[PDB]
Design a protein around this ligand. Structure first.
Ligand SMILES: CCCCCCCC[C@H](CCCCCC)C(=O)N[C@H]1CCOC1=O
Ligand SMILES: CCCCCCCC[C@H](CCCCCC)C(=O)N[C@H]1CCOC1=O
Lengths: 234, 234
């Protein structure tokens, strides 16, 4: 019965409601641990992650002290692939010090679902349990639903914490500013853009500086990458 | 019940076989028309679209001869939103000239499903019929399936046409080349990256030129944007 959920998320307006709802859905389908992580496209060098999980307090603090995101293969699947993943904490060969430590906190049998979202958000819903591997008969029972709720969860989580982790989501670029960045994306100089758009060079640099301040960028190369990562150049 | 589909998609190796499968799904689920479109990220200025629909031929030619891609609010929804959409051509207030002609050819009640995929491909499956609105009972009946088949279809549509519509999808970047472009994204110079990474400046320029040649780009700014759009910079 997925009809009742559509009204639940239509009224949720805080993290604690999101922290409580995903926890309730985590247990309603036979899972003890959940982890809804989102990867903002900023900063473009080392992007910032934001997780909301009920993992043990020792694990929620140890995951950040050693930068486990750079070695976690569960994060890697959501970054390069677009399909769900069924994983058992004992199968992975590399990063044994990470999995031998993760298996201690009851993070063994899990189900992670990567989804894309607005403003360049690469989110993923992960429901983990310390018992019973997920078989093919259990997957096809809840596969189509968990794919649907993952898109709905990240959609509400999107509009909820976008102004926090993606402050440039509220940026609106004018028609001139957008085409200035579209041509800066292909490495056009101010003079090359002038001949393309048939205006003066000082008018090309004009809209660039305004777009950089809107996107809170220090140069036009970073502003263009920022505008593209959010979707202002689609 | 999807065992035929999951086997059919594995057998499909041509663009004509893909048209037949989507036409079978379009009718098996109570619709007259379908449209599957994919947007390659290149060129970054005006990206090229590729459609496959059984719309009336008069509409298909008018859609391209008048460049309806720029004004179609369904196209705008798929680029900016990540959730399914139920639309009725008679509800829209703006772009009436576009909707009155689509309603003329029977494109009235539609169901559009945007999906993201490898190599920066943005795809969307649309199911349209000229009568009988899509009620809430009908949506909760087959939305989970239509969400699932759209992800499978775009995966096949990718492998089918990615070597043609995104030629840089076969490009693989090394670790050094990847991080050179990561710092080039934020406007760093050759010397700044060399100090940041504690490597010789000539080695930085070395990997940059190689990445430009692999990604078929004339300047490092364009190559950086190309690598990001394909997902090489994640
Ligand atoms: C996939 C794109 C970004 C999404 C990141 C979330 C995926 C990995 C999360 C990280 C949990 C960190 C919580 C600290 C408070 C996850 O579910 N990891 C699992 C898998 C291995 O052990 C875990 O804890
Ligand atoms: C989001 C990724 C891009 C997907 C492009 C397709 C979306 C819109 C399609 C276009 C069909 C073009 C066929 C002629 C070649 C679509 O079905 N649009 C509908 C909406 C209203 O009238 C249409 O034609």
């Amino acid at each position: 019965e997925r009809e009742g959920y559509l009204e639940i998320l239509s009224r949720i307006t805080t993290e604690e409601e999101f922290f409580s709802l995903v926890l309730e859905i985590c247990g309603n389908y036979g899972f003890e641990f959940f982890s809804f992580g989102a990867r903002a496209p900023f900063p473009l060098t080392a992007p910032k992650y934001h997780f909301l999980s009920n993992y043990p307090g020792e694990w929620k603090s140890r995951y950040i002290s050693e930068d486990y995101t750079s070695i976690d293969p569960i994060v890697r699947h959501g970054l390069l692939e677009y399909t769900p993943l069924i994983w058992n904490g004992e199968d992975f060969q590399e990063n044994r010090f990470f999995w031998e430590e993760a298996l201690h906190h009851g993070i063994r049998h899990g189900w992670s679902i990567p989804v894309r979202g607005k403003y360049g958000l690469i989110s993923m819903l992960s429901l983990v349990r310390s018992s019973e591997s997920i078989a093919a008969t259990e997957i096809l029972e809840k596969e189509s639903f968990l794919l649907w709720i993952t898109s709905m969860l990240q959609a509400t989580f999107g509009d909820l914490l976008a102004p926090r982790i993606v402050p440039e989501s509220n940026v609106r670029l004018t028609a001139r500013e957008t085409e200035m960045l579209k041509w800066t994306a292909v490495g056009k100089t101010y003079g090359e853009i002038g001949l393309i758009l048939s205006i003066d060079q000082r008018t090309v640099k004009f809209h660039i500086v305004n777009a950089m301040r809107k996107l809170n960028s220090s140069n036009k190369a970073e502003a263009t990458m920022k505008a593209y990562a959010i979707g202002l150049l689609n």
